[PDB]
């Protein structure tokens, strides 16, 4: 939900003034979108060991998790090995017993997504859709009618 | 000749090849929706299916996800070209396909669509290309940094052996601020907690608690029917509860007004910053372009520095190539003496070098190739084959 | 040392003017194969 | 939610719609204008690429049999077969560089056995070079395979 | 590189059993060397300022860069970074019938950033024309704005 | 605790950079033993209590 | 090498200083290393000369 300025100093900045004392580092960059999403790149030297450089970075973010909103703590925070580019992109569709672009996206993320990302050293996996969730669409007219709030 | 046919021969890093797989990205203007960008991704799929059945096996469009970042303003179709056997000519190969794809999307459209090649490589090493970055070092803000970058992009485009320059990350769109007057709220008896989780859990959504669907633990989310949260006037439809049991609308304490912000705040090295993505000129080449952008950065206002994100740290036919070739001579002579004894033998082999080089430059400069990596290793294979042939001439005769 | 000096690399172009070495290993194996073996076969059997 | 005065019951459905749908509606994909999801896997900053992609099929293959009626896998954007072309059009090139050489040796020396000794003095050297790159750390790369041709 | 990590991946199992005061304060696991080397002093000459104005500028421009640069263990500030300091008078507190609990509550309400949603997202009605981010409560910026908290 | 020792309340923004907000007291109301009784807490029933 | 790069960041910071702000250098190890080379490689050279 958070706008671009909200995430910029409630998540982004907090991590940036707590991303120090790390072995090897050329620079740090960052993005902070209006869709409530932040993502930092700590680039290291040529072939700095990524097994330990990942750990040092995510053992430093941990000292700044308590200074973020409780909304961001219970959401997906992550420190992963990157490679700006895909390789295998396994599409998934239906033919006979036809279903939607939502029914298929859940089955992908509730059977085969969790297996893929842990298999043979995958960096990160981007779902092309969304896993199912008990969605609740509150009507504000039938909310005032019984005297209530969200 | 060996000089002239080398200085003028241009410098690349690695060929941008046909990889049996390319792609193309989409981008809409200030504050477009999911319905709007879907119209553009649809038109894009038809050029690749209706006007390109022979060369395109498949398409995989994705609404609202550019490789810049994210939002409903973006998109990306992943193309998978038919196998190489069925694609015969240069006509039906990526360079040609993405050529008339970009022309078609710039002709019968009104947004921003391209169709870039598939490097291999990574994003870097474009060659005759740079990546500048503009830092707010002092205590200025977003409004003062934006204005400074406009001056850097304008001075670039007002005295360019030219240059091409492009931001295309910040766009700069409006935002709907809601001033909640706090004295008005607590007067009628509403908590500021209650109010913030009404506006937050209705419009933006709120992760409440976990449940179980079909064995697997998933999430429960709470928001609203779409129609009660589309435009400005639906703010007053929500009624919070005040202490004394009665309802209170949002229009009571709130106040609507628009305001300019940015949907992509970037920051470089603990400080606010904005990306500048100019490629060097078709005449000049990198080292010249970057240094004639550095004196533009120092002409800017106070509290505005710069730093080169970030390409590269030291290049290949640039700087490196020298130092390596340098030592490569230094030894060649030494070891041609470890088996020879003179101050004459080595020189003979040490000036066959240019014999084989002017030939390599001839073919390279003549056909449409260039000094890249593959040329920079056929060169050293040839001084090995030149000393070879020669050393036979010498050894036997001596 | 036309090859390995150039195979002392520099940055993102690390394994690029590097993996020479692939071709110096090839040189020293052809020298080996020729210092050994070719001597043999040539003698062993020719005309 | 409530029990209003007269014994009436306000339930969660009486104020709001309730459907099972995705946790994020920001992105939805289409495979040729057909409703689709998919796994867009990205590499892990040092991973073995084509070995990793072979094991993306490993998990995926055990998943296929337990699919609902219609669910079928398709393959857009895939790097794997580019590697299969850079071996079968390099080791083929390799073989043509013998075949052609073989002639030059006969053209100059009509002795058959003479056009043979050099034809064995390079297949062997090729293999010895494979054993040094393995011992030093490198792999069969697009680059190091072009170094077997040069 | 690993002995530091093992230690700080064990402290983490005991963070929940500490006060919430210590969690939101600076916990750290760093590489030590009981001794300094470079000690860069910072003073003023012409436009003279205090031993507090200088200490903030050090820690809000050049401190965060130093500690991440070329493998620095830890950095000790010789002063303190600025902070919105509030000196509560207890006589003017009893005069309006109040406590520091009411002061603290007023700052964790008026001085806060709220994540309001966005017009036009996230799953819209098919045909919406615009899509912008809603702004709400913004964090305070100046000493004057902290004086006008109700 | 929030008078004598200070208490880290919440974060704010000064000149772009996120810093901290602290709450304590004017120095003179917390120097010696006798200034303990100067602080009045509020009890349930609306009246002050030293 | 680490202390040379303490100057790296510090050098890019100098230009954007308020009026008066100037860097000074107490307690510094760096130049002790410069003396242990120029009074050792000098010693080296005297051991030839002699
Ligand atoms: O960071 C990297 O990617 C590498 C780093 N190093 C140095 C050790 C830190 C290498 C060292 C190599 N050699 C050292 C000299 N003996 C032969 C091996 C090498 F071949 C490759 C690399 C890298 O790719
Ligand atoms: O403005 C943009 O978004 C882009 C601009 N340019 C041109 C340089 C100004 C591009 C050029 C590309 N290619 C040029 C020809 N060689 C391959 C790369 C490209 F793939 C993408 C873009 C953009 O996205």
PDB file of C-alpha atoms and ligand atoms in Angstrom, chain B residues 16 25 114-117 119 126 164-166 168 277 279, ligand 2:
ATOM      1  CA  UNK B  16      25.247  -9.143 -30.120  1.00  0.00           C
ATOM      2  CA  UNK B  25       9.190  -4.155 -23.335  1.00  0.00           C
ATOM      3  CA  UNK B 114      10.815  -1.055 -28.285  1.00  0.00           C
ATOM      4  CA  UNK B 115      12.288  -4.575 -28.876  1.00  0.00           C
ATOM      5  CA  UNK B 116      15.904  -4.831 -27.727  1.00  0.00           C
ATOM      6  CA  UNK B 117      18.429  -7.475 -28.799  1.00  0.00           C
ATOM      7  CA  UNK B 119      23.252  -9.384 -25.526  1.00  0.00           C
ATOM      8  CA  UNK B 126      27.585  -1.847 -24.502  1.00  0.00           C
ATOM      9  CA  UNK B 164      22.423  10.733 -26.830  1.00  0.00           C
ATOM     10  CA  UNK B 165      21.023  10.896 -23.267  1.00  0.00           C
ATOM     11  CA  UNK B 166      17.976   9.352 -21.536  1.00  0.00           C
ATOM     12  CA  UNK B 168      13.277   7.161 -18.345  1.00  0.00           C
ATOM     13  CA  UNK B 277      21.733   6.570 -19.123  1.00  0.00           C
ATOM     14  CA  UNK B 279      25.212   6.319 -24.753  1.00  0.00           C
TER      15      UNK B 279
HETATM   16  O1  LIG H   2      15.176   4.839 -24.409  1.00  0.00           O
HETATM   17  C1  LIG H   2      15.172   3.615 -24.224  1.00  0.00           C
HETATM   18  O2  LIG H   2      14.374   3.042 -23.421  1.00  0.00           O
HETATM   19  C2  LIG H   2      16.147   2.775 -25.012  1.00  0.00           C
HETATM   20  C3  LIG H   2      16.976   3.458 -25.859  1.00  0.00           C
HETATM   21  N1  LIG H   2      17.891   2.889 -26.658  1.00  0.00           N
HETATM   22  C4  LIG H   2      18.717   3.683 -27.551  1.00  0.00           C
HETATM   23  C5  LIG H   2      20.140   3.928 -27.167  1.00  0.00           C
HETATM   24  C6  LIG H   2      19.150   5.051 -27.138  1.00  0.00           C
HETATM   25  C7  LIG H   2      18.009   1.500 -26.682  1.00  0.00           C
HETATM   26  C8  LIG H   2      18.951   0.886 -27.524  1.00  0.00           C
HETATM   27  C9  LIG H   2      19.093  -0.493 -27.574  1.00  0.00           C
HETATM   28  N2  LIG H   2      19.979  -1.120 -28.447  1.00  0.00           N
HETATM   29  C10 LIG H   2      20.667  -0.266 -29.421  1.00  0.00           C
HETATM   30  C11 LIG H   2      21.261  -1.100 -30.536  1.00  0.00           C
HETATM   31  N3  LIG H   2      22.162  -2.140 -29.967  1.00  0.00           N
HETATM   32  C12 LIG H   2      21.447  -3.001 -29.004  1.00  0.00           C
HETATM   33  C13 LIG H   2      20.873  -2.151 -27.898  1.00  0.00           C
HETATM   34  C14 LIG H   2      18.213  -1.243 -26.741  1.00  0.00           C
HETATM   35  F1  LIG H   2      18.248  -2.595 -26.802  1.00  0.00           F
HETATM   36  C15 LIG H   2      17.306  -0.668 -25.908  1.00  0.00           C
HETATM   37  C16 LIG H   2      17.178   0.733 -25.851  1.00  0.00           C
HETATM   38  C17 LIG H   2      16.218   1.361 -24.956  1.00  0.00           C
HETATM   39  O3  LIG H   2      15.513   0.609 -24.208  1.00  0.00           O
END
